[PDB]
Every structure is written in structure tokens, then in C-alpha cells.
């Protein structure tokens, strides 16, 4: 449906999900997301996501299966989540205001960025198996 894709990672470790608090732009700063970024020319979804998580968080991940449905952000961009597994590193907020590990009991009530909120059921399911 669009020409531009934004990939995001659902990193689950020890039964909790990594969420990242945006610091920009103003309209999203303070709200929580699955970290990731735009797929750039030449990149696969996995290349782009692993690169974004290395840049933003300082971690190495393996990119797994899609999580949940694609989301239309606007007329130009589609947002897609993938499950990812931590291979090496501890996440650090290089670009984000804060990081947090959340369990199933926290997913629904988190101050999500609006687009990511459609993934709530999928994230809760992922944390429960
Ligand atoms: N889990 C996420 C990740 C991103 N987005 C939205 C926010 C932006 O509208 C768009 C692009 O996200 P980026 O984090 O890549 O924003 P940038 O604009 O910083 O990308 P770049 O600066 O590389 O152009 O996707 C979102 O709704 N949910």
C-alpha cells in the first residue's frame, strides 16, 4: 500500500518486552514505542531493523517473524513490527528519552505512540508464550 516502510522490533527477554520512550518530534516525545526506523534503499527489513537497534540501543539482535498487522502511518509510510531476540549487549538509550522492560500487565496501559497501540494484543500474546 505504500512505498516507504518503517520497521520496529519487539524484543522480548526474560518474559518482558523492551519499550523505548521517544524524545522527538514534539508530537511523539514522551510516548512509548517499539524501537526501529525507516528501511533505506538497498536494505532488507532485517538489515534495517538490526541496524536501527544497533544504532539506537547498542545491541545485536536476530530478526524473527512478523508481529501483528502492518499499520498505515500516513499516505506515505507503513509500520511493521518483527519479533527480535537479543544476541549480544544491554539496551542503552542513545536516542530515546528512556527505556523500560514491561510485562503483560503493563502493555495495555502504557502511553504508546498512537500507531503502536494496535499491537497491544499481539504483544501480550507474545509475552504469554
Ligand atoms: N514504533 C514506531 C516507530 C516509528 N513510528 C513512526 C514515527 C515516525 O512518524 C515514523 C518514522 O520513525 P523514525 O523513528 O524512523 O523517525 P525518524 O523521522 O527519526 O527517521 P529518520 O530520522 O531516520 O528519517 O514512524 C511509530 O509510529 N512507531
UniProtKB/TrEMBL annotation:
<dbReference type="InterPro" id="IPR015797">
    <property type="entry name" value="NUDIX_hydrolase-like_dom_sf"/>
</dbReference>
<dbReference type="InterPro" id="IPR020476">
    <property type="entry name" value="Nudix_hydrolase"/>
</dbReference>
<keyword id="KW-0479">Metal-binding</keyword>
<dbReference type="GO" id="GO:0008413">
    <property type="term" value="F:8-oxo-7,8-dihydroguanosine triphosphate pyrophosphatase activity"/>
</dbReference>
<dbReference type="GO" id="GO:0035539">
    <property type="term" value="F:8-oxo-7,8-dihydrodeoxyguanosine triphosphate pyrophosphatase activity"/>
</dbReference>
<dbReference type="GO" id="GO:0006260">
    <property type="term" value="P:DNA replication"/>
</dbReference>
<keyword id="KW-0235">DNA replication</keyword>
<feature type="domain" description="Nudix hydrolase">
    <location>
        <begin position="2"/>
        <end position="129"/>
    </location>
</feature>
<protein>
    <recommendedName>
        <fullName>8-oxo-dGTP diphosphatase</fullName>
        <ecNumber>3.6.1.55</ecNumber>
    </recommendedName>
</protein>
<dbReference type="GO" id="GO:0006281">
    <property type="term" value="P:DNA repair"/>
</dbReference>
<dbReference type="InterPro" id="IPR047127">
    <property type="entry name" value="MutT-like"/>
</dbReference>
<dbReference type="InterPro" id="IPR020084">
    <property type="entry name" value="NUDIX_hydrolase_CS"/>
</dbReference>
<keyword id="KW-0460">Magnesium</keyword>
<keyword id="KW-0227">DNA damage</keyword>
<keyword id="KW-0234">DNA repair</keyword>
<dbReference type="Pfam" id="PF00293">
    <property type="entry name" value="NUDIX"/>
</dbReference>
<comment type="similarity">
    <text>Belongs to the Nudix hydrolase family.</text>
</comment>
<dbReference type="InterPro" id="IPR000086">
    <property type="entry name" value="NUDIX_hydrolase_dom"/>
</dbReference>
<keyword id="KW-0515">Mutator protein</keyword>
<dbReference type="GO" id="GO:0044716">
    <property type="term" value="F:8-oxo-GDP phosphatase activity"/>
</dbReference>
<dbReference type="GO" id="GO:0046872">
    <property type="term" value="F:metal ion binding"/>
</dbReference>
<keyword id="KW-0378">Hydrolase</keyword>
<dbReference type="GO" id="GO:0044715">
    <property type="term" value="F:8-oxo-dGDP phosphatase activity"/>
</dbReference>
Amino acid at each position: 500500500m505504500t512505498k516507504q516502510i518503517v520497521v520496529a522490533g519487539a524484543l522480548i527477554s526474560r518474559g518482558t518486552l523492551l519499550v523505548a520512550q521517544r524524545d522527538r518530534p514534539a508530537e511523539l516525545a514522551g510516548l512509548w514505542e517499539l524501537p526501529g526506523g525507516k528501511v533505506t534503499p538497498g536494505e532488507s527489513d532485517a538489515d534495517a531493523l538490526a541496524r536501527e537497534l544497533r544504532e539506537e540501543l547498542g545491541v545485536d539482535v536476530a530478526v524473527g517473524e512478523r508481529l501483528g498487522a502492518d499499520v498505515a502511518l500516513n499516505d506515505a509510510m507503513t509500520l511493521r513490527a518483527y519479533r527480535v531476540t537479543l544476541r549480544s549487549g544491554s539496551p542503552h538509550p542513545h536516542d530515546h528519552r528512556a527505556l523500560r522492560w514491561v510485562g503483560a500487565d503493563e502493555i495495555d496501559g502504557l502511553a504508546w505512540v498512537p500507531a503502536d497501540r494496535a499491537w497491544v494484543p499481539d504483544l501480550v500474546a507474545a509475552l504469554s508464550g
